[PDB]
Amino acid sequence: DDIYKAAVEQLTEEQKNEFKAAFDIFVLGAEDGCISTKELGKVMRMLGQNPTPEELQEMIDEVDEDGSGTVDFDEFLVMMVRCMKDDSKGKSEEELSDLFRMFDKNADGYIDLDELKMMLQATGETITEDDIEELMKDGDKNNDGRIDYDEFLEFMKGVE
Amino acid sequence: TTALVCDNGSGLVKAGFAGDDAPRAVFPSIVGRPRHQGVMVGMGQKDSYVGDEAQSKRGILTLKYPIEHGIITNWDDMEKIWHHTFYNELRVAPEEHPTLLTEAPLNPKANREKMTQIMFETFNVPAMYVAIQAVLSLYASGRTTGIVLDSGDGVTHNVPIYEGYALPHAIMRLDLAGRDLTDYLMKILTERGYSFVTTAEREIVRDIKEKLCYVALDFENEMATAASSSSLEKSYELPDGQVITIGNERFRCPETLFQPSFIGMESAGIHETTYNSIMKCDIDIRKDLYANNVLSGGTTMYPGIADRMQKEITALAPSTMKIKIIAPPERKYSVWIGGSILASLSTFQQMWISKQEYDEAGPSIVHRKCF
Amino acid sequence: TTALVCDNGSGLVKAGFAGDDAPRAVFPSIVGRPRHQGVMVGMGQKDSYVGDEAQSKRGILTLKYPIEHGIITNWDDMEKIWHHTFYNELRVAPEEHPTLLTEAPLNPKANREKMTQIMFETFNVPAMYVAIQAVLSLYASGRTTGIVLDSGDGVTHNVPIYEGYALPHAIMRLDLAGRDLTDYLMKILTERGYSFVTTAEREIVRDIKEKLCYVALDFENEMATAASSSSLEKSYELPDGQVITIGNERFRCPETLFQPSFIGMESAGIHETTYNSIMKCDIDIRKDLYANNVLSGGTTMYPGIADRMQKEITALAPSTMKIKIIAPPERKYSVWIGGSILASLSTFQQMWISKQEYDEAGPSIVHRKCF
Amino acid sequence: ISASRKLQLKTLMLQIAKQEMEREAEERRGEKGRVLRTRCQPLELDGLGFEELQDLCRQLHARVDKVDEERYDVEAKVTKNITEIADLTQKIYDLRGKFKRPTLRRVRISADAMMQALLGTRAKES
Amino acid sequence: GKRQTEREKKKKILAERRKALAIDHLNEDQLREKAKELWQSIHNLEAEKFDLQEKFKQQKYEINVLRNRINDNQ
């Protein structure tokens, strides 16, 4: 699902129209472009299934970042692909721990913003300082300027 | 591969693959042979409808549960139920999946040994493990201490656990459960004129009990109120019309839990066997058990039981201790959720009873180190 | 570098770096294996909780002290206690620190030799020295004479010292101490209905003894008063509620010190073994010993003992001599404070048993000049 | 914005870290091999008298015994360190276990199967 | 007998890693072969010691990490 989402991410915008057409083929009557609890429940009941609205709202909250509680077009695509689960085992804990232990050049048991900057410069991918700030926020929950082992695991949780 | 977390239970078989939130298929465990003659030819009439199919044709069947009180009394029917569960409700051949059955505490050995022998010879699973139904319910709550009262439909048992060390001398197993409450409700309904006798109508009385009955906070006040006003009389429509009105039978059926003298049982209610189970524990872990009392099992879903039980225990317990009763909304499937969590653990992956081990020591392997 | 002033004791291990005022880490010396079965998997359950960790999980452990009466009866457990003390309570590897153990007078040789052999082979310290527990308590008082009664928890010993010259023929070691008082209190509590049996409940009785018991100034008058009025009955709340009321058990438990016939011991009380220890000394230093009687050790912390003992000795002693009892408020850690002072001295810096010396003469070096 | 780019950046960081770890490990292996080659004295198995041969062999045997003792001591020390770090890991689990058990994600029932059953082969994702 | 066991194991290692070595009855080819065996044994011991050093480094690093985690948790 997420892998399929990434694969389709290299396609045109009309695939969203195709997915809307398929959803209409299922449960025609949708007009707003947002799949709330009622629409997903109805389509699964037609299929012979019933997703829990708690899971649906959890998906809405996880996909939301600004706190809007709604879905944009790309957010609609992410919500649609969230109906299935494919990210299994989150790669491997031991390899992630080894990479984190390699990250600590000073061997202080923590990763600061400077080490993050050095690792990003080593990567060399097209990135901006805003992405660095977002990654630091997603990693440093307590905002102590360091990364704990538990906090590093949470930042790498569900990451392949 | 993935493990099959089956949970035989007594009244509802709950099964599903390890690692999910809810059991995949939940269906009553009844096997009912037809009892009339049958005149249509070629209708494709089978000789035994099991599971949820026999709750729709129950008008011409004689349903009979294969599990009486935790123990299994009819092994052929139980084998049929397991075969149905594996092949039609999950559609996964057992040759490629470990299984994790569950068993009540203090059950006869022969039951457990026969269960493992069946699972290894007939269905031919790779490896199976049997776990006590209360430790799983403690897993699901995310605790590691606490005394869990797992009032199922067959048998109510009360296993105290501290810091992961179970106390085998403090398990109080009582055989009053949902089935006896159904029979008592069916027996007190006759005081208004409604007579249910057939084994099919026991299901109707069970539905009445589930939808209408509730546990009274104070019994005498409710008995006095229901005898003067009429604000309690709730009506219910039978499967054919002729609505019935339940008066003070509403809170008298589940009151049997706290006064087992109603159905002639000698023992004390579920409010006092928990306190006795606590008092058998050591003097230094009683505060933690008081604060982490856990409820589980289906029969603990009555509206208003988590308050009556707390009031009773607070009456019994010393005034200083804090009494807290954990009643998660997912009570019914708590045991199965805990089973899924336990089967999904990496540390547990080497505790299964591998088939070669069974071949070397026979069915009596279950009582050995692989518990 | 700095020296480690450890003090094994019996009941509380007190340790810390030399040159401070109070021990850094003080924790009971108990090692308790779990005794129940344990059903939670992956809970991370260890095989032995030592020190202060086993005073919190004592509900499911069987605590057992590794030091009975000064002597050490279980060497593996004592090694475990030392390892914990060095690595987790102080976090200093012993490879870089001298150690100064303490030992009761008149103890078996093999105990001391095994202690030094362990410290030199297992922990591999640079140099260790063993000192008598009473000379340190005399250091801490800042005196240089005086007869010190060090009533610990294992053994009560009474070492007289004059002008720095110890009198080896006047040491009176008596094996009544805090532990026997705990057992006697636990035995007389049964006269009201409270029964404590488990080795975990001995800790509760110890807490009762510490918080409530006191030494009566005059025994018969207190026995008469407690039998008529009710102004003495002090209540105490167990770890689970059910408060208890201690009557004349309050001053009867510590009275055993002055009348060891209560627990069946023949010898005379701590009020008369001090006078006997004085009378064995020479006729010209008895006045100084009378005037500088020192109390130490934990068990001498009972409220009202420094007056009862003075009254008793004044009754025994000649009427002209002045009897003075030094009872510093820091009684419990007096031995360790004295140990710190002794380890901080420059003159003492060449008395350590250096490792090369042990390699040349074996563990029997401790009885030699390096005492 | 969307977490897809953030996920790509994180995966790039992980891949770069893995490559750097591989490079560092290979360099460490090479350095270790060179140091080990330097440590051991080269053999001189030519132009030696038979009695001199036996004397040199006995000297080598004595040095072998010395290195055996040294390596046994180092092995014991490392074993003690392993035991101590295992105890530390156990304590870490005790302080970080309890309720911190990860849970799998199976609450979603099979959706692709029903989609294909009720819509033929239109569901091209699954 | 734990310390006794350690001493016994060490003494065995004195005779286990190095067996009964009698060079008197060994000819020049045999002497060269045994000397090469000794040299290779010493090299292997060096390799094991180097690996032990690396493992000890890793153990110290992970111990520091665990101490940091313990401090942070409380």
Ligand SMILES: Nc1ncnc2c1ncn2[C@@H]1O[C@H](COP(=O)(O)OP(=O)(O)O)[C@@H](O)[C@H]1O
């Ligand atoms: N919502 C409910 N309210 C009251 N009673 C219930 C409810 N749901 C189930 N029960 C009772 O609980 C029983 C099911 O218990 P269950 O936990 O399935 O037993 P088991 O432990 O064998 O699985 C039913 O027989 C029914 O009598």
Ligand SMILES: Nc1ncnc2c1ncn2[C@@H]1O[C@H](COP(=O)(O)OP(=O)(O)O)[C@@H](O)[C@H]1O
């Ligand atoms: N405040 C107190 N009041 C009465 N008794 C005490 C008090 N504190 C400690 N004790 C008794 O003294 C014992 C501790 O003695 P301690 O001096 O630690 O022995 P050790 O010489 O082995 O260190 C305890 O077992 C307790 O019974």
Ligand SMILES: [Ca+2]
């Ligand atoms: Ca949004």
Ligand SMILES: [Ca+2]
């Ligand atoms: Ca760093």
Ligand SMILES: [Ca+2]
């Ligand atoms: Ca942080």
Ligand SMILES: [Mg+2]
């Ligand atoms: Mg159950």
Ligand SMILES: [Mg+2]
């Ligand atoms: Mg002492």
